[PDB]
Design a protein around this ligand. Sequence first.
Ligand code: K
Ligand code: MG
Ligand code: MG
Ligand code: MG
Ligand code: MG
Ligand code: MG
Ligand code: MG
Ligand code: MG
Ligand code: MG
Ligand code: MG
Ligand code: MG
Ligand code: MG
Ligand code: MG
Ligand code: MG
Ligand code: MG
Ligand code: MG
Ligand code: MG
Ligand code: MG
Ligand code: MG
Ligand code: MG
Ligand code: MG
Ligand code: MG
Ligand code: MG
Ligand code: MG
Lengths: 201, 101, 53, 303
Amino acid sequence: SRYSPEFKDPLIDKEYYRKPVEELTEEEKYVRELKKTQLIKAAPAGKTSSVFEDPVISKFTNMMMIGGNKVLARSLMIQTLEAVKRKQFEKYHAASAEEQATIERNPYTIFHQALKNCEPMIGLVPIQVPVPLPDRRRRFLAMKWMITECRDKKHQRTLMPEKLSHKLLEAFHNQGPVIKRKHDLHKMAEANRALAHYRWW
Amino acid sequence: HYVDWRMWRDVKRRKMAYEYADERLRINSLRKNTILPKILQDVADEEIAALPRDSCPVRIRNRCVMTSRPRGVKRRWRLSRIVFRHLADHGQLSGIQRATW
Amino acid sequence: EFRDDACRKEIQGFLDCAARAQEARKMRSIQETLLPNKLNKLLQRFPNKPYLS
Amino acid sequence: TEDFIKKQIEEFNIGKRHLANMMGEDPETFTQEDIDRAIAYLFPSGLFEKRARPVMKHPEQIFPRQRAIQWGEDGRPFHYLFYTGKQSYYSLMHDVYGMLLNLEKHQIGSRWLIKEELEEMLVEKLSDLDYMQFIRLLEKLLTSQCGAAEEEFVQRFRRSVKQLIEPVQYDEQGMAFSKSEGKRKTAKAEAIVYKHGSGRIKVNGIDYQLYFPITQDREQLMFPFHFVDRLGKHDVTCTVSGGGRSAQAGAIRLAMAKALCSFVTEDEVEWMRQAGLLTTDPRVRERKKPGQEGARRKFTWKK
RNA sequence: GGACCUGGCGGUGCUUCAUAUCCCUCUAGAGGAGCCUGUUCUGUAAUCGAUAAACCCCGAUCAACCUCACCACCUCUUGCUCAGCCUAUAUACCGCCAUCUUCAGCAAACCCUGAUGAAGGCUACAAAGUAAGCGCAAGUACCCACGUAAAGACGUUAGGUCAAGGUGUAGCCCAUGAGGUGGCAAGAAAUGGGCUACAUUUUCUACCCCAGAAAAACGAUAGCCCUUAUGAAACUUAAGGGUCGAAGGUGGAUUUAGCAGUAAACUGAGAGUAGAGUGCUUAGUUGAACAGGGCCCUGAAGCGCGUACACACCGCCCGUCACCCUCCUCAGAGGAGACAAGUCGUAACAUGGUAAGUGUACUGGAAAGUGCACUUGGACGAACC
Ligand SMILES: [K+]
Ligand SMILES: [Mg+2]
Ligand SMILES: [Mg+2]
Ligand SMILES: [Mg+2]
Ligand SMILES: [Mg+2]
Ligand SMILES: [Mg+2]
Ligand SMILES: [Mg+2]
Ligand SMILES: [Mg+2]
Ligand SMILES: [Mg+2]
Ligand SMILES: [Mg+2]
Ligand SMILES: [Mg+2]
Ligand SMILES: [Mg+2]
Ligand SMILES: [Mg+2]
Ligand SMILES: [Mg+2]
Ligand SMILES: [Mg+2]
Ligand SMILES: [Mg+2]
Ligand SMILES: [Mg+2]
Ligand SMILES: [Mg+2]
Ligand SMILES: [Mg+2]
Ligand SMILES: [Mg+2]
Ligand SMILES: [Mg+2]
Ligand SMILES: [Mg+2]
Ligand SMILES: [Mg+2]
Ligand SMILES: [Mg+2]
């Protein structure tokens, strides 16, 4: 890394800086004073202060990226979000007044809830042994499972936006091959339950 | 007293090519055009073939001038990579230096 | 049938227990650092003398 | 030795006078800087290592501090700690211990000189352990709530260790602006940010929405103004070259942020720096190395 | 033969580590297809060298003739050279290098300990080490003081190169030298690397990123024909065009690289040629994911332990079965020793992979296995944990 170890990662959060001094604790005051003497890495070209920045969606776009085609990855992500929103609006209009209360229409909420539903609780590690999964690994496994399922060859000629929107809605409703894969992981963990003692941590 | 018989042959080839270059250029000018009659071009072809074999420029090989290495010869200095490295490392070539970037 | 609908409570307990185990690992690791190094340093100042001065 | 060093010093003075005469300058006012400049002109040397280039410094600088004899004609050393082999260091430790004893009986931008500095002061080789012991003793002395004499004695060993804002200028109409420059990858940009406007940014005379079709690059342009809550409060004219679309966007972002520092308050400037808007991203392409595919991709290990 | 020292080794103990590295984890590949190319095997009249890591787009930043050292035929003999030889010897060397090395050690000269043995020299609240010098480091180039370069000692593998050139030794001297004409270079078959793909995050077009069409087509840089570039000579090389629309549908074990402007993808330039690479060097653009657990698996370090090894485990070595000798007992046959290779195993030497051995008994191709008791000529890491 061209950055010397002294450089510190940038904190991009307007609220953190607009916070009044009075609300700050002594530890927080000391941290703010110290940061005035430290070097700060240049803000990456990916994340900004836009209120429409969703780190989960940014990470999903990065994962979907192929060969540094960030433009195409972003295009696919926005197309998927638009397709999800349009399907939700169509269902909302086609639905009765009662079901319109239930029918969600926010693509960001749909995406977050779908990935959360696809997050696996217990993993398997060679030691195979059932084991707890850290939160970062859970999120990455959810995202990778979603992307791999969308990239599966079983879908013929269907475009990635449509495929991913359909899979995302299925996951949001707790259905689809992604949830099936999570259930399969859980079932294998249950089957190897007896081997849980092999784990030394 | 050239380095080896191969370098001597290349020297002979260079001398012959320099001797016959003008005649070769003249005869090949007739062949390398689409204006003159095909019969004239064919007689020119047989003449250029009749010229001695060693006069062909393609037979000139760029051998190192100090060790007769037939390959790895830097044209600007006419020295095989080994001899060029020797002289440059000992610092006997102006400007050249070990590169680091 | 491996459906989270009712398992929510047990799954939450599992996650809390895993977090507690990780936190305990960290706390033990930090708290571990009389240690053998210090004890050996103390001993070297008073070496056993199986010979004669 | 004294005779050699004196001969060198006299020779250096005589050569200094000759150099002043050769350069046609006053021999008396000729300084070390003048000597260095004259020598550099007279013997141009492009060798990168400055120590390798010709030098005519004073013999005091040229020669090392070769230590004097420690025992007289009778063979009796001068320092009672002579046989310790580190008389200077151990005498210093003895003095520090005595000062600590006296303190006990009676009762921020400065670091500690590195082991190299301590060795230079003590004209004695030292080990890291010895230096650490000495530094710990000095720390105890300072913490002991000592007097002014002890503090000034410690000062012998103590060693003293924000963004800059461009100046606002005025255009033909007198309206205020600021100018800045930045670089990213191979891209280089220069930005002029005016004090008032409708958020209109013209890159190479083209509006940003047309120069950067990519929403990512447009967000990069937006980032500084959005950070400082000034969306639409300024107009900007930027000229960029080199690099690709993303490199140009980053360079323009950096230049615009640096210019905006001329207007935003100091608190906002510091917040921008902490957010990273005012740090030139050193990350550039890494040269391909011979025998490997790229900067780090080695060839497929054959078996 | 007994006891030790040093080193190598240990399917050796504990502890701490590996930061693209040992495992899991992340990305992209190879292993499945075609093509290009190197190597091996076959073939030929037809090089040579490298060839485990550290060979295999390697000597070559380059083979139609030449290059060429190879083969066939022909020709010359003081020959370009006060000759010549690409003849053997890299196990004589210089020269330039691989290698651990992604190491920090090597150290002359002193001093001390061991009863003045090989050898060893460590405790910082310090207990015999001091050390010039080399290396690291530092300094330097690139864009910082970062990172990448560069650098990286002494030694190991008698590691590579007698074919860069020189050189010792040995060898040919009407040829193992010199010259000319012509000629190989293909693929039964395998294998390494690279390229192109298998597509929808795709393909064609416009633009160079707000579009329209294709979509069982995608997919050859392959094959065949034609033209053009260079050249005396093109089926041989390259480019273009036409024609064809092939194999294949993300690929088993296993395996490679990568910690950030990196991987991945994409676009140029240069060296070298008359021409010639999907090869090499280099410039630039877009530009990721994990980065946390560990030591059950591989290596590193520290402290240890064992050692019948010292060409240092790719070691050493046991017994049978077959083979020649010398001696002994024996109605002819056995035993021993020696010479000596194979054979089957791996019994012992490290916890020798079931610790070893003594007595005794049963069993078995063969070292030997097991049973009962006994020895340490094994260990149990030596506070609590
Ligand atoms: K493959
Ligand atoms: Mg040529
Ligand atoms: Mg690896
Ligand atoms: Mg293949
Ligand atoms: Mg071969
Ligand atoms: Mg060979
Ligand atoms: Mg020929
Ligand atoms: Mg030939
Ligand atoms: Mg010959
Ligand atoms: Mg050798
Ligand atoms: Mg090397
Ligand atoms: Mg290097
Ligand atoms: Mg260095
Ligand atoms: Mg050898
Ligand atoms: Mg060899
Ligand atoms: Mg001959
Ligand atoms: Mg074709
Ligand atoms: Mg032609
Ligand atoms: Mg087609
Ligand atoms: Mg055994
Ligand atoms: Mg055993
Ligand atoms: Mg037994
Ligand atoms: Mg039995
Ligand atoms: Mg007894």
